């Protein structure tokens with residue numbers, strides 16, 4: 405057997421060099437520059453973004469690097485190191501929603517979304533992508549691709565949104581619109597906010613209430629693992645990839661209609677404020693027509709409050725309490741939200757039995773990755789324990805990634 409694999413992040417120099425070479429090898433011309441956007445892990449606050457709740461992601465050091473040059477025509481050519489001989493070409497002139505096939509829908513839909521927003525200066529482009537964000541592993545390769553493309557287009561077309569946090573929200577909404585309306589993948593905004601608004605050494609406490617301005621809806625929460633002698637273990641289970649996500653949103657929207665609220669954040673805040681939170685929840689669930697919907701509402705309400713509990717626990721250096729909150733977030737996703745699979749649940753169980761302060765699935769679920777707060781120096785040991793258990797179970801070998809709170813998207817070269 406081979407020891408469990410760790411996926412190292414591309415350095416600045418590596419990502420620039422590789423993206424530039426693929427661009428020149430593909431297109432002949434030099435790119436105007438290279439931009440990049442990171443993947444992410446959500447620390448806690450899962451299935452809450454589309455309920456107007458609270459989330460707490462970090463940006464991974466793993467980035468997608470885009471080499472880009474604008475075109476004077478409306479042609480879009482993209483290529484990726486995943487399949488470097490296969491250039492995808494589309495045209496923006498008259499392009500409609502779902503008018504692009506395959507991965508190229510993600511970058512092309514970002515230029516489409518900016519033109520739909522009235523950015524008529526945005527024409528076509530050539531791009532080459534090189535990434536170390538694994539595809540389809542619940543680490544947000546999709547946002548790293550759409551956000552890197554949005555920051556690059558904003559830069560070359562001089563739209564003036566990329567150089568401020570608030571201005572990045574315009575680029576975020578174009579990234580979300582690309583993925584929702586061009587690629588046809590429902591996204592709630594956690595991942596794109598992480599990729600373009602996280603900061604090094606911090607977690608992004610994101611308030612997803614849709615009426616808030618950009619300066620109102622984020623606060624940078626110190627997330628210095630070294631201060632507490634900790635490591636954040638991230639393990640991509642590599643469980644075989646899997647409209648269950650549609651059904652979860654639909655159930656939450658129906659719950660909010662029955663309650664007479666705009667969103668379950670309203671519900672959760674009313675329960676949170678009660679002296680008797682147990683009775684406030686019971687009265688809410690009593691209003692709901694069926695046992696499954698009650699489970700879904702119980703998850704979103706308890707999970708929004710766990711985000712505030714986590715932010716408090718971590719600031720107090722109470723790592724045991726922070727871990728317990730990871731644990732409770734996982735258990736809620738497994739039992740009440742029903743979005744776990746055996747690989748996630750067994751990886752988490754191995755982490756918990758091997759000294760993790762806590763461990764949980766991250767992202768949407770149904771596969772993908774787990775995270776665990778562990779003592780510094782224990783991440784390899786716990787990863788290898790998960791890989792040894794995975795082989796005993798007949799599962800695909802997992803892989804791990806080093807993780808700490810890294811920088812958001814940026815221009816890498818010009």
Ligand SMILES: Nc1ncnc2c1ncn2[C@@H]1O[C@H](COP(=O)(O)OP(=O)(O)O)[C@@H](O)[C@H]1O
Pocket residue numbers: 468484485486506507508510533534535538539540541542543544545546547549589
């Ligand atoms: N480097 C890349 N090159 C080409 N396509 C990519 C790349 N990264 C992401 N994609 C596209 O995005 C999809 C992965 O996004 P998604 O299914 O949302 O998973 P995740 O966001 O968890 O990584 C891929 O199937 C492909 O269509």
Ligand SMILES: [Cl-]
Pocket residue numbers: 478496497498
């Ligand atoms: Cl046009």
Ligand SMILES: [Cl-]
Pocket residue numbers: 651652655696700
């Ligand atoms: Cl459901």
Ligand SMILES: [Mg+2]
Pocket residue numbers: 544545546547
């Ligand atoms: Mg995705």
